[PDB]
Design a protein around this ligand. Structure first.
Ligand SMILES: CC(=O)N[C@H]1[C@H](O[C@H]2[C@H](O)[C@H](O)[C@@H](O[C@@H]3[C@H](O)[C@H](O)O[C@H](CO)[C@H]3O)O[C@@H]2CO)O[C@H](CO)[C@@H](O)[C@@H]1O
Ligand SMILES: NCCCCCCOP(=O)(O)OP(=O)(O)OC[C@H]1O[C@@H](n2ccc(=O)[nH]c2=O)[C@H](O)[C@@H]1O
Ligand SMILES: [Mn+2]
Length: 273
């Protein structure tokens, strides 16, 4: 009986003030967001959203950043009238980090909860400054964090696709998901850009003002050192994407926690093979 939500949300306020100098209390955030259900799930009560979005955050030892992320994003996602869920994919252990593999885990596991048809992949330390920057999918892969303060409010290079992006379920499946072998920092986002291009797609982006994004300044994490093989790997994406991705993925979930503001999947994704 509920009608469809309007194509563009009438609730948006646009430019917002973002700051990271204050403490955040998630119990309070939960109180400020009474309509967000257990596990960090929300859908509008007055209309049906065509956007069924699973937001996937690759993660390890970034609780402080995550608190700010939840504090700022939950209000924004609800104003965008999305039927969404938050998933923090926590890498078990203390061996070399694997951002893209965790993102694949997020895609596969979120699908076990609900019929999501859109996936937003977001680093934990990126906060949008304008709610007109849609956290949902488009006819083409969508690059969301286009004008980050750390890059001088512009793209670092025109083919940059890192930070925050959204791929529909079909777009993601079409590229066999993300690569599983980019251990350590760098290149996996360039590999993903290549995958999309090699499958006939092009990147969709909001304008630079609407796409303004803040990065929470932080120091280098241990166990995610720049991958020396990254330059060689992105040069062979066309060939490697055929057999490295969703169709070559295995992992072992160790724990699933449903917190009020998000679902945390702690997973063992192993080490290089
Ligand atoms: C493959 C890779 O590392 N991609 C990351 C991307 O890398 C940029 C880098 O930020 C900068 O734009 C430039 O850096 C040169 C590169 O490291 C080369 O090998 O050595 C010279 C020595 O002077 C560097 O200046 O080009 C890289 C390749 O496009 O940066 C983005 C944003 O941080 C990462 O998301 C991406 O993974
Ligand atoms: N001068 C200090 C510059 C710090 C350089 C470190 C590289 O920074 P960035 O390119 O922002 O990458 P990053 O934030 O370390 O990694 C991207 C994303 O991986 C996740 N991530 C990475 C490493 C880690 O230990 N834990 C974690 O959760 C997190 O969602 C993060 O936002
Ligand atoms: Mn960062």
């Amino acid at each position: 009986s509920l009608p469809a939500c309007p194509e563009e949300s009438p609730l948006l306020v646009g430019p917002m003030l973002i700051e990271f100098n204050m403490p955040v209390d998630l119990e309070l955030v939960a109180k400020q967001n009474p309509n967000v259900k257990m596990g960090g799930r929300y859908a509008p009560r007055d209309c049906v959203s065509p956007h069924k979005v699973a937001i996937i955050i690759p993660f390890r030892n970034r609780q402080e950043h995550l608190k700010y992320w939840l504090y700022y994003l939950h209000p924004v996602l609800q104003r965008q009238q999305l039927d969404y869920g938050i998933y923090v994919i926590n890498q078990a252990g203390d061996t070399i980090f694997n951002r893209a593999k965790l993102l694949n885990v997020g895609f596969q596991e979120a699908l076990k909860d609900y019929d999501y048809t859109c996936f937003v992949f977001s680093d934990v330390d990126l906060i949008p400054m304008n709610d007109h920057n849609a956290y949902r999918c488009f006819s083409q892969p969508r690059h969301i964090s286009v004008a980050m303060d750390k890059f001088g409010f512009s793209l670092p290079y025109v083919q940059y696709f890192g930070g925050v992006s959204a791929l529909s379920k079909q777009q993601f499946l079409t590229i066999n998901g993300f690569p599983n072998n980019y251990w350590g920092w760098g290149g996996e986002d360039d590999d993903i850009f290549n995958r999309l291009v090699f499958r006939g797609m092009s990147i969709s982006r909001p304008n630079a003002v609407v796409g303004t994004t803040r990065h929470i300044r932080h120091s280098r994490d241990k166990k995610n050192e720049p991958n020396p093989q990254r330059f060689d790997r992105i040069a062979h994406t066309k060939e490697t994407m055929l057999s490295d991705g969703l169709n070559s993925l295995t992992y072992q979930v160790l724990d699933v926690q449903r917190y009020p503001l998000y679902t945390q999947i702690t997973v063992d994704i192993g080490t290089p093979s």
